[PDB]
Amino acid sequence: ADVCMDPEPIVRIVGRNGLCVDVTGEEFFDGNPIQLWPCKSNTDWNQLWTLRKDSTIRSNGKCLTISKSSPRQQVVIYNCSTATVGATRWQIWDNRTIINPRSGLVLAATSGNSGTKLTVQTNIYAVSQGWLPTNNTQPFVTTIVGLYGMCLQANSGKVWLEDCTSEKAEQQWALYADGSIRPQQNRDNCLTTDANIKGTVVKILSCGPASSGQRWMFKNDGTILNLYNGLVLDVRRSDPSLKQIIVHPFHGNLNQIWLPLF
Amino acid sequence: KQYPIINFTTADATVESYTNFIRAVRSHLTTGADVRHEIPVLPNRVGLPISQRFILVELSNHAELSVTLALDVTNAYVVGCRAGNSAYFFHPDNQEDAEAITHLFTDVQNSFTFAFGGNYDRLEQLGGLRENIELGTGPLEDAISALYYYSTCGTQIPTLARSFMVCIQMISEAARFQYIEGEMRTRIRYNRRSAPDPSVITLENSWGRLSTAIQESNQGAFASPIQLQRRNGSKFNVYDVSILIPIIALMVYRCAPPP
Numbered sequence A: 001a002d003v004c005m006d007p008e009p010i011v012r013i014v015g016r017n018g019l020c021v022d023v024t025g026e027e028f029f030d031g032n033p034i035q036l037w038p039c040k041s042n043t044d045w046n047q048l049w050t051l052r053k054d055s056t057i058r059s060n061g062k063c064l065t066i067s068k069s070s071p072r073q074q075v076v077i078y079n080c081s082t083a084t085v086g087a088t089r090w091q092i093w094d095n096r097t098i099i100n101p102r103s104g105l106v107l108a109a110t111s112g113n114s115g116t117k118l119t120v121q122t123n124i125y126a127v128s129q130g131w132l133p134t135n136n137t138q139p140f141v142t143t144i145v146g147l148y149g150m151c152l153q154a155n156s157g158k159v160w161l162e163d164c165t166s167e168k169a170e171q172q173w174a175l176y177a178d179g180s181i182r183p184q185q186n187r188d189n190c191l192t193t194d195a196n197i198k199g200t201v202v203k204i205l206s207c208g209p210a211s212s213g214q215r216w217m218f219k220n221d222g223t224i225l226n227l228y229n230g231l232v233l234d235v236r237r238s239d240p241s242l243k244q245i246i247v248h249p250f251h252g253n254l255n256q257i258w259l260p261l262f
Numbered sequence B: 001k002q003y004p005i006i007n008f009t010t011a012d013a014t015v016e017s018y019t020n021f022i023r024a025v026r027s028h029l030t031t032g033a034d035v036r037h038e039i040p041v042l043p044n045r046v047g048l049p050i051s052q053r054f055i056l057v058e059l060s061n062h063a064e065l066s067v068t069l070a071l072d073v074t075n076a077y078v079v080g081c082r083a084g085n086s087a088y089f090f091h092p093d094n095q096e097d098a099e100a101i102t103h104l105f106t107d108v109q110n111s112f113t114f115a116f117g118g119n120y121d122r123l124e125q126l127g128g129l130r131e132n133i134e135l136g137t138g139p140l141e142d143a144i145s146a147l148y149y150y151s152t153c154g155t156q157i158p159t160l161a162r163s164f165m166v167c168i169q170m171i172s173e174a175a176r177f178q179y180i181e182g183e184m185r186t187r188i189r190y191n192r193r194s195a196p197d198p199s200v201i202t203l204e205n206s207w208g209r210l211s212t213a214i215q216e217s218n219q220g221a222f223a224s225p226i227q228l229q230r231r232n233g234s235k236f237n238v239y240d241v242s243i244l245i246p247i248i249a250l251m252v253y254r255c256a257p258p259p
C-alpha cells in the first residue's frame, strides 16, 4: 500500500460573510488576535495559511492558536513551539468545520463584521463556525436544480421550486464558504430553516444570525443537509405546485435530490 | 464464473428507472467500501482478482434489443460490449488489461477486439466531438440498436464510436459524477436529447485529475487548483473538495490512505 501525500497547501480561509482569516494589522507577535478581514487579492502573508502535515495552520511560521488569555476562547497567532502544542493543532472538516481537537471547540466568528476577532466555540454547526480552505474567495454562484429538473427560486423571504429560465436572477444562488446558501438578488439573506423539526418549511431570512439553520452541507448523495438538525432539503409532497421546500428526514427520493448546476 | 449484471431499458424509462440504474451501477463498483472525503473510491486495479474485475450492464430498448457493455470496476469505463452472439472489445492500453478483457464474453465465438482503444481521444477521431454527440433516452435507444447490429453490417464504425460514447457518458460518466447523472435525468425527464455542455465534458476530462487532487489533499485542501468550466464555457478554479462532494461520486484509486 503506497501511501498518499500531504501537500501542505497554502490557502486563504474564508468564513462568515466570506471574509478571510486575517492576522490583525500584520503584527506577528505571540498573542496578536486573528480576525475576519475582507479577502486580499495580493500575496500578503497575514491572509495565507499553510496546512502543514502536523495539523497546524501556520501563517509565516506562526500558528493559528487558542489564547489562554483571561476570558479565553480567543484565537490568536502564536510561536508554534512556544505555544501549548494542543492549541495549535486543528482539523479542517469536509463539513466546513475547523476544529481544535484538544478542546473540541471550533473556530468561530461571532460577527459578520470585518475586524471581528476569531474565537473558538462549541460546535453547533452554525454559519459563524463554517470555513473553507480555498484561494477562491468568491461565492460559488450557481443554480440549484431539484425535482423535475426544476430550479430553486427565491422571491422575498419565500423560496419554492420553479421551471429553470436562463435569465431569472431569482434562480441564482451564491454558495458561501461559510456553508450558507444565499440568493444572488440579496446576499444579505439566507436559505433558512427557523426550526429543527420535520415539515419545517424553509425560508429566505436575514443571515445576521449565522445560525445553524442557515448553514448547509451538500452531501455526496445529492441531498442538501443541515448538519445541526440532520434533516435535508425536501420538496414537500414531491409536489413543486405546493411552492414549499421543507426539511425532512433523509430518504433519498428525487424530491430530496439536488444538483448545483453551474 | 459470471460477473454481476445491472439492468436498464430505454423502453418507457423514467428519471427513477435511470436513477436506480446508476445507483445500482455505483453500488456494484463500490462494494469495496473505501470512501474519502465522502466520495467513494473504486477498487484498486493493482492486485484486483480477475473474478471481481468487471460488472455487466444489460441494456434493452423499445425495439426489444439487448447489448451488454462490460465495465472495468477499476474506472467504471466500458471496455467492451456484447451484441447478442457477437462481442467486441476496445484495444487495451496495456498487456495487463488486454489479458483481463479476455475473461469477458468467452462463450461468444465472434468475439474480437478492435485496433482502436475506447478513450475519447480515439472515439472522437472515429466518430466526432463529444460536444456534437447528442445525449438522452433517444440516442441511447439508437446507440443500443447500432451496437446490436454492428456484427450484421448495420453499423458504421464512426457510428459504433458514437454509439459507444453516448453509453459511456450516459452510464460510466454518470456513475462517476452525480452531476452528469443529474444532467441525464433532466434530459430523460423531458425527452429532450442534447449534447454535453462544457461543464460535462470538462468533468469527464478531469475525472483523473480530480480523483488525484482529492486523494492527495491535506484536509480537503488541494496542493494545486483543478480547473473546471460552467455550462457557459467560462473556467474556474477549485482549491477545495467541499465544492465537489456533490459533483463527483466515484474516484479511481490513486494511493493508499495513510494509516
Ligand SMILES: OC[C@H]1O[C@@H](O)[C@H](O)[C@@H](O)[C@H]1O
Residues within 6 Å of the ligand: A009, A010, A011, A043, A048, A135
Ligand atoms: O508559492 C506561493 C503561492 O502558493 C500558493 O499555494 C498560494 O495559493 C499562492 O497565493 C502563492 O502564495
Ligand SMILES: OC[C@H]1O[C@@H](O)[C@H](O)[C@@H](O)[C@H]1O
Residues within 6 Å of the ligand: A022, A023, A024, A025, A026, A037, A044, A046, A047
Ligand atoms: O487594520 C487591520 C488590517 O491592517 C492591514 O494592514 C492588514 O493588511 C489587513 O489584513 C488587516 O489586518
Ligand SMILES: OC[C@H]1O[C@@H](O)[C@H](O)[C@@H](O)[C@H]1O
Residues within 6 Å of the ligand: A061, A079, A081, A082
Ligand atoms: O520564531 C521566533 C521564536 O522562535 C522560538 O523558537 C523561540 O523560542 C522564541 O523565543 C522566538 O525567538
Ligand SMILES: OC[C@H]1O[C@@H](O)[C@H](O)[C@@H](O)[C@H]1O
Residues within 6 Å of the ligand: none
Ligand atoms: O526564528 C528565529 C528564532 O528561532 C528560535 O528557534 C530561537 O530559539 C530563537 O532565539 C530565534 O532565533
Ligand SMILES: OC[C@H]1O[C@@H](O)[C@H](O)[C@@H](O)[C@H]1O
Residues within 6 Å of the ligand: A093, A094, A095
Ligand atoms: O468522527 C466522526 C466525525 O467525523 C467528522 O469527519 C465529521 O465531519 C463529523 O460530523 C463526525 O461524523
Ligand SMILES: OC[C@H]1O[C@@H](O)[C@H](O)[C@@H](O)[C@H]1O
Residues within 6 Å of the ligand: B005, B006, B007
Ligand atoms: O443477482 C442479481 C442479478 O440477477 C439477474 O437475474 C438480474 O437480471 C439482474 O439485474 C441482477 O438483479
